[PDB]
Amino acid sequence: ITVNCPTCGKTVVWGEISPFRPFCSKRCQLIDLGEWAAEEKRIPSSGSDDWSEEP
Amino acid sequence: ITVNCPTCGKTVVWGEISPFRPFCSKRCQLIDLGEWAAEEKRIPSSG
Amino acid sequence: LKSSYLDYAMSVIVGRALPDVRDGLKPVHRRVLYAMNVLGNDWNKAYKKSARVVGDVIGKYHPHGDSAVYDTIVRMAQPFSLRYMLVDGQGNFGSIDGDSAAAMRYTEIRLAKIAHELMADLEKETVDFVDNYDGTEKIPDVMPTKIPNLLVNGSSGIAVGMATNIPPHNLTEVINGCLAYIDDEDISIEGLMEHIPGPDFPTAAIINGRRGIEEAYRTGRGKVYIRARAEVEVDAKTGRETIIVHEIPYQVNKARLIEKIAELVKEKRVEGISALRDESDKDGMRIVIEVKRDAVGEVVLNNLYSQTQLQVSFGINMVALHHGQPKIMNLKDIIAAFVRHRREVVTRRTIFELRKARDRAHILEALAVALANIDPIIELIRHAPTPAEAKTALVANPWQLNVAAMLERAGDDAARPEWLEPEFGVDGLYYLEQQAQAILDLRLQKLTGLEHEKLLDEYKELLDQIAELLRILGSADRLMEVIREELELVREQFGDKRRTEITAN
Amino acid sequence: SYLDYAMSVIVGRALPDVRDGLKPVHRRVLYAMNVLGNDWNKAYKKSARVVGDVIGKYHPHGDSAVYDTIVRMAQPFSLRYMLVDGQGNFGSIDGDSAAAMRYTEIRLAKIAHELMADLEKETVDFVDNYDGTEKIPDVMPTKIPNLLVNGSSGIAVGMATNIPPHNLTEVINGCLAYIDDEDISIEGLMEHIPGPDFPTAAIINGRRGIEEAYRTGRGKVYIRARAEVEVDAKTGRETIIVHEIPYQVNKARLIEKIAELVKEKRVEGISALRDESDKDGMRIVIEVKRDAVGEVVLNNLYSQTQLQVSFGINMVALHHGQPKIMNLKDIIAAFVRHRREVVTRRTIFELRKARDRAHILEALAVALANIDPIIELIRHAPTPAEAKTALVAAMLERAGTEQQAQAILDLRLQKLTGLEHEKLLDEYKELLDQIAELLRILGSADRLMEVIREELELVREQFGDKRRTEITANS
Amino acid sequence: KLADCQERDPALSELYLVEGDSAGGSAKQGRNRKNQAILPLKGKILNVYDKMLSSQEVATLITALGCGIGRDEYNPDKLRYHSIIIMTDADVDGSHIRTLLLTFFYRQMPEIVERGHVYIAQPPLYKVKKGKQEQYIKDDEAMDQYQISIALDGATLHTNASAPALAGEALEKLVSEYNATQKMINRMERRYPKAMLKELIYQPTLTEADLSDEQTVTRWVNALVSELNDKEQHGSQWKFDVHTNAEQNLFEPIVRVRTHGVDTDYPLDHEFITGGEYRRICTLGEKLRGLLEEDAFIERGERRQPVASFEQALDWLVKESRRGLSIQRYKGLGEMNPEQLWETTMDPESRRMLRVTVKDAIAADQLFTTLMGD
Amino acid sequence: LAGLPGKLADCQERDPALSELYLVEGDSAGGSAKQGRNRKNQAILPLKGKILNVDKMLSSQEVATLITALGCGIGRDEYNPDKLRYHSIIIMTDADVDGSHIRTLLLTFFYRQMPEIVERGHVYIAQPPLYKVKKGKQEQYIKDDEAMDQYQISIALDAGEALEKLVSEYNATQKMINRYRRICTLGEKSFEQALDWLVKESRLSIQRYKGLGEMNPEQLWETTMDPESRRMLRVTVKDAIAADQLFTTLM
Ligand SMILES: [Zn+2]
Ligand SMILES: [Zn+2]
Numbered sequence A: 001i002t003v004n005c006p007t008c009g010k011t012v013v014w015g016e017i018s019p020f021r022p023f024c025s026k027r028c029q030l031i032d033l034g035e036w037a038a039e040e041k042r043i044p045s046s047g048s049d050d051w052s053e054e055p
Numbered sequence B: 001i002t003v004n005c006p007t008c009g010k011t012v013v014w015g016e017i018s019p020f021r022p023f024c025s026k027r028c029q030l031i032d033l034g035e036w037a038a039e040e041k042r043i044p045s046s047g
Numbered sequence C: 001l002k003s004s005y006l007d008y009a010m011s012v013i014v015g016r017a018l019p020d021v022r023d024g025l026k027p028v029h030r031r032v033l034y035a036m037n038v039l040g041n042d043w044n045k046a047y048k049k050s051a052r053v054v055g056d057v058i059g060k061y062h063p064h065g066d067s068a069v070y071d072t073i074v075r076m077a078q079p080f081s082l083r084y085m086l087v088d089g090q091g092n093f094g095s096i097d098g099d100s101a102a103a104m105r106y107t108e109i110r111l112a113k114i115a116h117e118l119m120a121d122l123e124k125e126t127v128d129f130v131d132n133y134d135g136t137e138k139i140p141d142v143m144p145t146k147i148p149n150l151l152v153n154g155s156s157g158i159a160v161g162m163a164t165n166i167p168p169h170n171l172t173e174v175i176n177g178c179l180a181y182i183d184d185e186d187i188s189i190e191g192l193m194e195h196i197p198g199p200d201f202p203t204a205a206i207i208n209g210r211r212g213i214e215e216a217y218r219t220g221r222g223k224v225y226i227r228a229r230a231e232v233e234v235d236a237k238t239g240r241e242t243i244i245v246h247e248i249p250y251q252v253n254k255a256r257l258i259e260k261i262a263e264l265v266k267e268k269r270v271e272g273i274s275a276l277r278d279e280s281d282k283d284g285m286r287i288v289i290e291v292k293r294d295a296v297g298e299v300v301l302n303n304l305y306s307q308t309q310l311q312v313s314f315g316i317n318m319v320a321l322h323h324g325q326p327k328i329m330n331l332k333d334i335i336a337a338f339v340r341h342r343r344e345v346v347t348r349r350t351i352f353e354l355r356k357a358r359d360r361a362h363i364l365e366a367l368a369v370a371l372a373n374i375d376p377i378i379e380l381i382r383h384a385p386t387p388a389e390a391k392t393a394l395v396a397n398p399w400q401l402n403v404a405a406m407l408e409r410a411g412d413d414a415a416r417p418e419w420l421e422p423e424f425g426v427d428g429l430y431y432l433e434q435q436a437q438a439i440l441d442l443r444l445q446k447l448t449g450l451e452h453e454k455l456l457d458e459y460k461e462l463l464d465q466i467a468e469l470l471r472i473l474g475s476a477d478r479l480m481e482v483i484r485e486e487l488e489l490v491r492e493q494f495g496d497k498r499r500t501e502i503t504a505n
Numbered sequence D: 001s002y003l004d005y006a007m008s009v010i011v012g013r014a015l016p017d018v019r020d021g022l023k024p025v026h027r028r029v030l031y032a033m034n035v036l037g038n039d040w041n042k043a044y045k046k047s048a049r050v051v052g053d054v055i056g057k058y059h060p061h062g063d064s065a066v067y068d069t070i071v072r073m074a075q076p077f078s079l080r081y082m083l084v085d086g087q088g089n090f091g092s093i094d095g096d097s098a099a100a101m102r103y104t105e106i107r108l109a110k111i112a113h114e115l116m117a118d119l120e121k122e123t124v125d126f127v128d129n130y131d132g133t134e135k136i137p138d139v140m141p142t143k144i145p146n147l148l149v150n151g152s153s154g155i156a157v158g159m160a161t162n163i164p165p166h167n168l169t170e171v172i173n174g175c176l177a178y179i180d181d182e183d184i185s186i187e188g189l190m191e192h193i194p195g196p197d198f199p200t201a202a203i204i205n206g207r208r209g210i211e212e213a214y215r216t217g218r219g220k221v222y223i224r225a226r227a228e229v230e231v232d233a234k235t236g237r238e239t240i241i242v243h244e245i246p247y248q249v250n251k252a253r254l255i256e257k258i259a260e261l262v263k264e265k266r267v268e269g270i271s272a273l274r275d276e277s278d279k280d281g282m283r284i285v286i287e288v289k290r291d292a293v294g295e296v297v298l299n300n301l302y303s304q305t306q307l308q309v310s311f312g313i314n315m316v317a318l319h320h321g322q323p324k325i326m327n328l329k330d331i332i333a334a335f336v337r338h339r340r341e342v343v344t345r346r347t348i349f350e351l352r353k354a355r356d357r358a359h360i361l362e363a364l365a366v367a368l369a370n371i372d373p374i375i376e377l378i379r380h381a382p383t384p385a386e387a388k389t390a391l392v393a394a395m396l397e398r399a400g401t402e403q404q405a406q407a408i409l410d411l412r413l414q415k416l417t418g419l420e421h422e423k424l425l426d427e428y429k430e431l432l433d434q435i436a437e438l439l440r441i442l443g444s445a446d447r448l449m450e451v452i453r454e455e456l457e458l459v460r461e462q463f464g465d466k467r468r469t470e471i472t473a474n475s
Numbered sequence E: 001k002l003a004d005c006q007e008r009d010p011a012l013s014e015l016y017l018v019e020g021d022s023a024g025g026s027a028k029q030g031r032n033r034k035n036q037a038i039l040p041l042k043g044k045i046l047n048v049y050d051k052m053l054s055s056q057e058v059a060t061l062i063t064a065l066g067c068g069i070g071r072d073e074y075n076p077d078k079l080r081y082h083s084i085i086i087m088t089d090a091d092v093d094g095s096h097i098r099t100l101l102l103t104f105f106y107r108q109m110p111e112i113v114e115r116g117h118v119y120i121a122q123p124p125l126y127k128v129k130k131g132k133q134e135q136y137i138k139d140d141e142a143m144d145q146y147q148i149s150i151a152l153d154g155a156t157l158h159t160n161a162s163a164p165a166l167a168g169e170a171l172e173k174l175v176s177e178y179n180a181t182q183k184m185i186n187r188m189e190r191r192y193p194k195a196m197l198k199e200l201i202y203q204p205t206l207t208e209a210d211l212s213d214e215q216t217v218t219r220w221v222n223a224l225v226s227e228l229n230d231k232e233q234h235g236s237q238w239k240f241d242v243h244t245n246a247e248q249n250l251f252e253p254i255v256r257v258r259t260h261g262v263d264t265d266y267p268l269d270h271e272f273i274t275g276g277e278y279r280r281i282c283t284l285g286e287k288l289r290g291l292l293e294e295d296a297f298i299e300r301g302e303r304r305q306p307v308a309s310f311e312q313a314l315d316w317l318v319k320e321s322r323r324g325l326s327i328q329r330y331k332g333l334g335e336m337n338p339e340q341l342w343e344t345t346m347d348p349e350s351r352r353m354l355r356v357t358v359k360d361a362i363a364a365d366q367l368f369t370t371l372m373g374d
Numbered sequence F: 001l002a003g004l005p006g007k008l009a010d011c012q013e014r015d016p017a018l019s020e021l022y023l024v025e026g027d028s029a030g031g032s033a034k035q036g037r038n039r040k041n042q043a044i045l046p047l048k049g050k051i052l053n054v055d056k057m058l059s060s061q062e063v064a065t066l067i068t069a070l071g072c073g074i075g076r077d078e079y080n081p082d083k084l085r086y087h088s089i090i091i092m093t094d095a096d097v098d099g100s101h102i103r104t105l106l107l108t109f110f111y112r113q114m115p116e117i118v119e120r121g122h123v124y125i126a127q128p129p130l131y132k133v134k135k136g137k138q139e140q141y142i143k144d145d146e147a148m149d150q151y152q153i154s155i156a157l158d159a160g161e162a163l164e165k166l167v168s169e170y171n172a173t174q175k176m177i178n179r180y181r182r183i184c185t186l187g188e189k190s191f192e193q194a195l196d197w198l199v200k201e202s203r204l205s206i207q208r209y210k211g212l213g214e215m216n217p218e219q220l221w222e223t224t225m226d227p228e229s230r231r232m233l234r235v236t237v238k239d240a241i242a243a244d245q246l247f248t249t250l251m
């Protein structure tokens, strides 16, 4: 049961063999946390109401 | 025929007495200019 | 010197940012409400989605992509913003904390009962209309309201050169004050105040001191302090005090208040707070503040009055548009202008009702004499292939007259249209096109025997009606009596307990 | 599971429907205009009116989407055949914004009315809106293949689309050629449809791409500007002026990119770059240094500047509710069979309506005969309900309900004139001629397709125009 | 959002300043290349809401204007366009864009306004369209003149029975006097009721010699208020009275009306009778009630209708003119197409344009301050 | 941070096992939840999705508040079951495109930075009623199309129990049509005439919910917050991985 590291892509496997699931190393884990903190984590807008006059 | 200086507020008489009208000195004029540059001449309306 | 353009701008801006004193509404209020009226979004009829009203409004009366419209629609629905709501909303319409209302496609809405009393006799040529942005629609310049509204729901807005800040009042009390005005024009402010002690707040809370209220109602301007209904409850077993707050001044944000308190204890500007919690739920507002072993409850409380909006100063500035210009006006002036409006409203109303009943009288008479004269008209129209020829034949010849007796029996000179020229109508010779069309477009389902009787009885009814209408226009005192019974009906319909306490000094 | 469903919803909201090639937005806008009576023969209506009701009834989110969609359907440079006639400032190819929704006036185009003909005749299915108080047409009963004619573009990630717009007359001729014979060859269709025709005039560089695109459903084909290069006759110098540019390209951003490339030395040999575009005509002026060659500058621009652009054509559209890739023949066929169902449905409606109307007309004419006998009978009973309870010949025989009695009772005295007899008689006979013709149409499919051909001839005649784009092939 | 030009001679060319969302695409696609240069600017800049005028925009504008900043560095020979058409919507939105442009001028380039280089654009207020006829009239003045023009186009007054029908220049003169006088009466609505002054033109004159008597004045005011009473539509009762003057024994009428409940008095003093306003009122007065008789006809073009008075006549005329056509008041420039914008507000042959005085710019500045002060 | 006043509507109950947290969509069910809940056992955190530059995202102010409110650590190594402030956490959001984004990301933050909180079963999704039917003196809320169908036929009747068996068999056969001896028994054994007469005799006001912001505070409370007559699903690690699949699909 292996799932890719969402930071670097290093395929690391589930279980106690990895203490930073689903990350491989903690630094990447921390980097992802920083991204969440930094609002680096987005989902692009689809082509849910926007007002033209409003901001 | 006197106009008030839009920067400092000092009254300056219209006419060639002062070369900076409607401003009293060039420093007031330049200040106003920079303000126009610094986007500080804005008009806020709400509702 | 204020020039011509300048004053233009000042005029439109104010005219958008202050209300007329008659209905106590700004343009956007009126537009939203009237649009809801045209759309027939009534109070006992099923809800509509906040979207449709908004779309209609943008299309007809407010052509901007502005949340302005949906924001107005929303505010009218929130119990904590309007004393007496003008919009019955279902769904999630926000919260006092500052939570937003759901998207305008989820939340549904329909006018409130009081809203219908705000637009009662609107179709009865009661008040001027005016063109919309494309001229293809009309919109009411004022509302034929039966509720004070201005005094009742209050008004708040900021403009170019002046602003208005009127608090809301209890309807019951305001109506009472109106009645007292009518019965006693020349009355005195001290007198009106016998019926309205002061402002009423949806939130509730308390008001501290009557002096400001009094100065306001006398002048139009006065500052009055709204204190929150907080309470200190002492737990018997441990002796550990715990404040608790149940209501808070009008227009104060719960979240910003709580955050301000937390900030105040973090900066250590106020001390003696062990915990700060928001326990408000379906049971109502509560704010729990837990006093430390070290501290005294009441002391912490007074600090939370001193450094927070748990006590706040409401500045009353009663400005409103008198005619097309803005004017500061005391309480009596306001009630007086409401009432003038009622005099104009009900008068225009009765003239419209008059014209209606007169036209109905004319046509019903035509139908009568048609029912009496059935066979020869069937024949004459029988023969003529063209409807216009049949019409001309109908008009060309007067006809004769159980139908005639009551025409004569229940006639004054007038059931006649005020537009009728002298020649037409009744020597026992009917001088008669309009009516000719009225019978040319007569259905066959009517030729039964008792439909006449129905039309006669209806004619007698209309005669009693025009009698009462003429009676109502004839005596000004009668007009006033009608208005009094109308207001009495209003305060019998919606009358609410006082919600805000008033304590002197 | 859930992701797949979201997958599907996105496809359903970002792809056209082959019968009319319209996304939900387009359809809702047009239909709102229709019910609003925003006709081409009647005066303009402010955009705010339309939008407004779009928001209230069909699409309530933001003006942003709904007025933009309207603006697109009005610009000559955006749509081949326009669906909205718009008076006022509706933006520029340089990317200038259309005026406020408050200011601009709009009304359906004649073409747009032809897109919605025979709608009220229960032709196409309706479906519910959010609130559920109103019904919206799932598909339009169009007499135009506006999918091919106006093209499309796919928002969606994953399946996406990029169908180009075509010339009306050519697609109509192709459709008639498909009517004549099924199983018609693709290359036989390319005889009628040489390729895509853009609203902006331009040159198409490779027809191999066009061919592969029409056949596969996918392909890549290059759009090339109509730049023209020219010397000043006695001066012995050159100047390049572009006259037209590829579909979906900002002139302002184009010239801006040219300025960039000049500034970065990436393009050399340009002495002066100017935009002399105006009401008389578009023209972009690119004055040549003496040291350089006009044509080589003109090809260097073709390369890195967007004077020439690679248009990747793909034809994914919704068929039976599912996103499928399609041939030219597949789309044309879907259009045709759609029209078959259309004509069938509407003719059935016309038939039933005429039958009911003739039934009523019959009862009415009976009442015109049985007048005096009836009038007394109905006069006796004091109640219209009780009297209702109490409730020529040659031609009905020759040319061959309680609600009928109600339709008789609900009749005006104006109807009992001598002329109305002849009127309703002529109407009756004409209705018999009509039901005869309608039955004759339902019976033979050949005549049905022949009338379809007649309508398409009408379309190619009335709204058909010249071809704007040029197609050159030199390999 | 950058300029464009064509001719280099500053006197021969001109520079428009136009809002980007209302008249950017309009001006660009409708301009004349040769002499006209326009600048697209956006009058609402994002901040975080919407508000102001851009710094970059300001720099671009100064460069486009071309001649220097402050009174010192002004240089008439370096101004690039000697006519600078602030063509902006002129509701309050637009007015603000325009104002910033005028204020900035006033403070930093007062010369360009003083030398009268800054002219402003004026589009047509109205557009009229009957069937075939489509036309543009610039203000409310031309709108009124047009209104009466089509009101009288091919129509005539039959005063007594069938007598020498009135029309042409004579009818136009009479109607002109009438409308002008009713403008005077419109103005007076603050002092006296309008209906009372219209019946003041129909009823006979009342000289001061008549004021020297009592029964004649009482008769006069009685006839007036009675006529007003019977002709009343809105349910308002009219009564009368004559106050007595001790000195010289003069008498003056008083009109009492119960309008809703509001019994109100309206005295007619001597100075009113002698003033001149009442003199014009009485000139038109004579001229018109001296005139229509009965059994009289007003007819326009094909159709005719009998008519009790002038009023009914003119009302039937405007009704007859308005039957076919409708009208639009132009509020924004975005309402117009490039061709229309060109034909209307930009064509150097058809355009109405306003030159600003230093006092105009000063006014704009007082407006700016007042608004910025909030 | 330390202080969650002003952004969190905590409950009375301090003992985490007995209390629950509600992560609601702010511009959806926020204010409603803050007015329907029970102050004894239910805390409430509203959330939004911000838009800058060119979309939806979970903001810094919020994550810090979220993390603070949860109280446990970040990263599998740091997780502390005793620091945890609530055993039950509800992600109360709509099902639309943004309602999916707020929720899924919620799990995704959870899947990556607090995976244990998902594996311990502490987090619970909230399920609201899909149907509200009101004949029009009375009304009821219906959970699933299954219960909706059973309700619909049970009332469609108003013949015996054998008729219930027959219509259930017919419905099974129609399900088979949508998707042998069964179909043969039906074919040997019109019908839809009487059935459709029943359909017309039954069909009221039918309402399908599309959002949480259609419901009144009291309604939301009764329908999906009140401990009695509620409904919620315990998300698995598979659900979180699926959420991360959606996220990585949309980046
Ligand atoms: Zn890694
Ligand atoms: Zn100074």
Ligand SMILES: [Zn+2]
Residues within 6 Å of the ligand: E091, E092, E093
């Ligand atoms: Zn404005």
